[PDB]
């Protein structure tokens, strides 16, 4: 018997999921962060965030199509994390690292928080 | 079991 | 600065497979000669040109049940579905032709090209 | 500036 391990398969799947997101194909939720809105696939959000995982495994919240995050959450920080979920790349700047880290803590993304700590 | 890595693209690319 | 998480995509895919096995947010059942396989349309579209076409077709994109061609082998489909969700393609001498035929039907040409190396 | 991180990036969903 034989097993072939396609080493860029997962990356290729994730790129295609990001392309679906950019085209708004099969997205099933909007995340509202104060004045800004971001469409996504619940499966990707649950895969990456303990907060979204907990929301969408609640039987009474699984069908929510609109999520309003806490008013204190920074939209730019959320956008950076959403892009990370769909690309594997976390793009930080001196002016936004604190907001990214705070948003990652709120989203229960502990490994991203740990990375952010390294950049002050 | 013979395990082999394949490093090329595995699936189609969805256009932007 | 950009931090590249080199195992992030694999970690996402594993979590998507865990959601599949727990039947969380799956939105379609694929029927192959009366055998049923639940999945996420997004993953099927990401991996297969046929499913990409089906789930954007205005006449089929809202169906929760998709019936494949009656000549499609259920074992071959299961092998390809597992590959979609894990990156691992398991081949045996007794099923490689069925796997290859199923990949051709699903428009997964890169998988077909790999199978050809083992013929 | 690009920096690789090879550790787990996200939580692991249980079986
Ligand atoms: Na999905
Ligand atoms: Na079922």
Mutation target for B interface from C114, C115, C116: give the one with most B CBs within 10 A: C114
Mutation target for B interface from C46, C51, C85, C106: give the one with most B CBs within 10 A: C46
Nearest one of A68, A73, A75 to A31, comparing CA atoms: A68
What is the H or E stretch that residue A42 is in? helix A42-48
Residue numbers in D near C4 (CB within 8 A): 2-5
A86 vs A44: CA distance, rounded Å: 8
A46–C2 C-beta distance less than 8 A: no
- In angstroms, this model's resolution equals 1.4
Task: Tell me how close the Cα of D2 comes to any Cα of chain A, in angstroms.
Answer: 9
- Cα distances (angstroms) measured from residue A3 to each of A33, C43, C71, C91, C107: 45, 21, 25, 6, 21
- Vertex A82: Cα angle to A78 and A87 (nearest 5): 145
Cβ contacts from A onto B, under 8 A: 49
A50 vs C97: CA distance, rounded Å: 42
List of chains touching C (3+ CB pairs within 8 A): A, B, D
For chains B and D, having 3+ Cβ pairs within 8 Å is answered no
Q: What is the 3-state secondary structure (H, E, C) of chain C?
A: CEEEECCHHHHHHHHHHHHHHCCCCCCEEEEECCEEEEECHHHHHHHCHHHHHHCCCCCCCCCCEEECCCCCCHHHHHHHHHHHHHCEEEECCCCHHHHHHHHHHCCCHHHHHHHHCCC
Task: Tell me how close the Cα of C43 comes to any Cα of chain A, in angstroms.
Answer: 7
The CA C34 to ligand 2 mean position distance, Å, reads 11
Task: Tell me how close the Cα of D5 comes to any Cα of chain C, in angstroms.
Answer: 5
């Amino acid at each position: 018997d034989s097993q072939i391990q396609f080493t860029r398969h997962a990356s290729d799947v994730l790129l295609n999921l990001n392309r679906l997101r950019s085209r708004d194909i099969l997205t099933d939720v909007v995340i509202v962060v104060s004045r800004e809105q971001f469409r996504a696939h619940k499966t990707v959000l649950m895969a990456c965030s303990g907060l979204f995982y907990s929301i969408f495994t609640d039987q009474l919240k699984r069908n929510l199509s609109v999520i309003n995050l806490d008013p204190e959450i920074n939209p730019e920080g959320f956008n950076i994390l959403l892009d990370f979920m769909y690309t594997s790349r976390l793009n930080l700047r001196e002016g936004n690292i604190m907001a990214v880290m705070a948003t990652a803590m709120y989203l229960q993304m502990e490994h991203v928080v740990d990375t952010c700590r390294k950049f002050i | 079991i013979t395990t082999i890595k394949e490093m090329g693209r595995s699936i189609h690319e969805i256009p932007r």
